[PDB]
Design a protein around this ligand. Structure first.
Ligand SMILES: *[C@@H]1O[C@H](CO)[C@@H](O[C@@H]2O[C@H](CO)[C@@H](O)[C@H](O)[C@H]2NC(C)=O)[C@H](O)[C@H]1NC(C)=O
Ligand SMILES: *[C@@H]1O[C@H](CO)[C@@H](O[C@@H]2O[C@H](CO)[C@@H](O)[C@H](O)[C@H]2NC(C)=O)[C@H](O)[C@H]1NC(C)=O
Ligand SMILES: *[C@@H]1O[C@H](CO)[C@@H](O[C@@H]2O[C@H](CO)[C@@H](O)[C@H](O)[C@H]2NC(C)=O)[C@H](O)[C@H]1NC(C)=O
Ligand SMILES: *[C@@H]1O[C@H](CO)[C@@H](O[C@@H]2O[C@H](CO)[C@@H](O)[C@H](O)[C@H]2NC(C)=O)[C@H](O)[C@H]1NC(C)=O
Ligand SMILES: *[C@@H]1O[C@H](CO)[C@@H](O[C@@H]2O[C@H](CO)[C@@H](O)[C@H](O)[C@H]2NC(C)=O)[C@H](O)[C@H]1NC(C)=O
Ligand SMILES: *[C@@H]1O[C@H](CO)[C@@H](O[C@@H]2O[C@H](CO)[C@@H](O)[C@H](O)[C@H]2NC(C)=O)[C@H](O)[C@H]1NC(C)=O
Lengths: 50, 50, 98, 170
């Protein structure tokens, strides 16, 4: 039965880690979009007149 | 195998002055590439078969 | 006209080519080269009036003084047709007699 | 999820490869962050430097140019910005670019845009006096250079006051 208890703990921790990874992926996508916008602004409004 | 500190590039001090300009006298025409993905493979999955 | 959007330099035209799952752009651009250094002044004082260039800039190879375009060296003699007048020259910082 | 236990590892073994793809995703995220920084800041072929003498028609860039006296080689505004804003199997990796290199990129960009205008973004940098560059920009926005060449002093004073107000507000 110790193995059953360990199984419960394992599945709970795995679920939590999966949730964390998914949230990190979403946030990374948003940050990448922001970085692309910043790169375009640096290219246009610093190296030239828009 | 050698480990070093990366260099940001070359370095020059452009000769600024308040009554001097630089004007080009010749030109070149260059051709460059850029590659952009637009699609990914269309796939389908069946539950009961899986 | 938006800088560095397609091609490093002034943009001229582009050509598309297909790809297995994407596209490939060939950008044709114009890049200046072989620069030369010159002496400059923002306006010319004549008869007490100030003259500015319509499009271009004043330069000189030591003497003479000419008007050129900004992206290609091509001197021309200064005439009342490629310049315009604005007031008397006492406030402009950098006037030269000619 | 096991904390160095043999039986826990053995039990976890029968779940397949649930952990290779997690590390794969995290490494992808890290590489993406490095690429983001590199592509946003590295846009200069060379590293330019401002001339020792600074007479930009009355404009004053002292608040923004780097200060060699300070060890960080950062500007006043950058230092204000940096001052204002503040294990169980997990690690944090340092970025590929240190802060000094980023500051050096910013300094190079700003020196290039002060001295050469917009020319250094297309080919090789070509020098030009700052007043003539401002005249070009006014000509760009639809106003003749007459206005700048007649109101240089007022324009410079307004710019300096605005930059000081920005410093104070920040
Ligand atoms: C502008 O550049 C082009 C190419 O760099 C020059 O054309 C070359 O001139 C040399 C000198 O005689 C020749 O040996 C090459 O064969 C030319 N190249 C081509 C593709 O024709 C041109 O002379 C330069 N213009 C000026 C005014 O210097
Ligand atoms: C045009 O003239 C200027 C000034 O004479 C030249 O500037 C030189 O730049 C080099 C490299 O920075 C220095 O070693 C020289 O001492 C500078 N000359 C001086 C200060 O008289 C410039 O190279 C010339 N050519 C161009 C294309 O600008
Ligand atoms: C600056 O360029 C001008 C444009 O050609 C030169 O003017 C003529 O140059 C030729 C060749 O040297 C002479 O034979 C003519 O007598 C010049 N005419 C005039 C009105 O100047 C000028 O010599 C050049 N100056 C320098 C210092 O290079
Ligand atoms: C451009 O810079 C030069 C210096 O390179 C300035 O010339 C100075 O002018 C002041 C006021 O007349 C003199 O006290 C200095 O002795 C001059 N310097 C030198 C080295 O002679 C000039 O005023 C600046 N502005 C222009 C030409 O419009
Ligand atoms: C351009 O020419 C004018 C007039 O020929 C010069 O103005 C003279 O300047 C001297 C010295 O200050 C005065 O003594 C004269 O009374 C002025 N004359 C006039 C009509 O204003 C002017 O100095 C010249 N500019 C340069 C740079 O030499
Ligand atoms: C550009 O602006 C700076 C403001 O930061 C000026 O530096 C000030 O100069 C005054 C007079 O020497 C001093 O009392 C202040 O303490 C300085 N401020 C700082 C933060 O050091 C600088 O003088 C201006 N540039 C010019 C050419 O006037």
């Amino acid at each position: 039965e110790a193995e059953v208890q360990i199984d419960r703990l394992i599945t709970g921790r795995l679920q939590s880690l999966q949730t964390y990874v998914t949230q990190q992926l979403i946030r990374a996508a948003e940050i990448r979009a922001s970085a692309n916008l910043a790169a375009t602004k640096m290219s246009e409004c610093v190296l030239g007149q828009s | 195998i050698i480990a070093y500190t990366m260099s940001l590039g070359a370095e020059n001090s452009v000769a600024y002055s308040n009554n001097s300009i630089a004007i080009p006298t010749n030109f070149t025409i260059s051709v460059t590439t850029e590659i952009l993905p637009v699609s990914m493979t269309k796939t389908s999955v069946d539950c009961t078969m899986y | 006209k938006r800088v560095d959007f397609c091609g490093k330099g002034y943009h001229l035209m582009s050509f598309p080519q297909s790809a297995p799952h994407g596209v490939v752009f060939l950008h044709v651009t114009y890049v200046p080269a072989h620069e030369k250094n010159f002496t400059t002044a923002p306006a010319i004082c004549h008869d007490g009036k100030a003259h500015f260039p319509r499009e271009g800039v004043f330069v000189s190879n030591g003497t003479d003084w000419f008007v050129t375009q900004r992206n290609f060296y091509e001197p021309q003699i200064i005439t009342t047709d490629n310049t315009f007048v604005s007031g008397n020259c006492d406030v402009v910082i950098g006037i030269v007699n000619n | 999820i096991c904390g160095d236990s043999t039986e826990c590892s053995n039990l976890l073994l029968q779940y397949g490869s649930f952990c290779t793809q997690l590390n794969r995703a995290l490494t992808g995220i890290a590489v993406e962050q490095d690429k983001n920084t590199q592509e946003v800041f590295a846009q200069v072929k060379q590293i330019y430097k401002t001339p020792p003498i600074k007479d930009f028609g009355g404009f004053n860039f002292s608040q923004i140019l780097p200060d060699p006296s300070k060890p960080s080689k950062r500007s006043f505004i950058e230092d204000l910005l940096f001052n204002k804003v503040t294990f169980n199997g997990l690690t944090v990796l340092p970025p590929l670019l240190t802060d000094e290199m980023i500051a050096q990129y910013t300094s190079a960009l700003l020196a290039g845009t002060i001295t050469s205008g917009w020319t250094f973004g297309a080919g090789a940098a070509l020098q030009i006096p700052f007043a003539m560059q401002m005249a070009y920009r006014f000509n760009g926005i639809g106003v003749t250079q007459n206005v700048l060449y007649e109101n240089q002093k007022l324009i410079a004073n307004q710019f300096n006051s605005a930059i000081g107000k920005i410093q104070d507000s920040l």
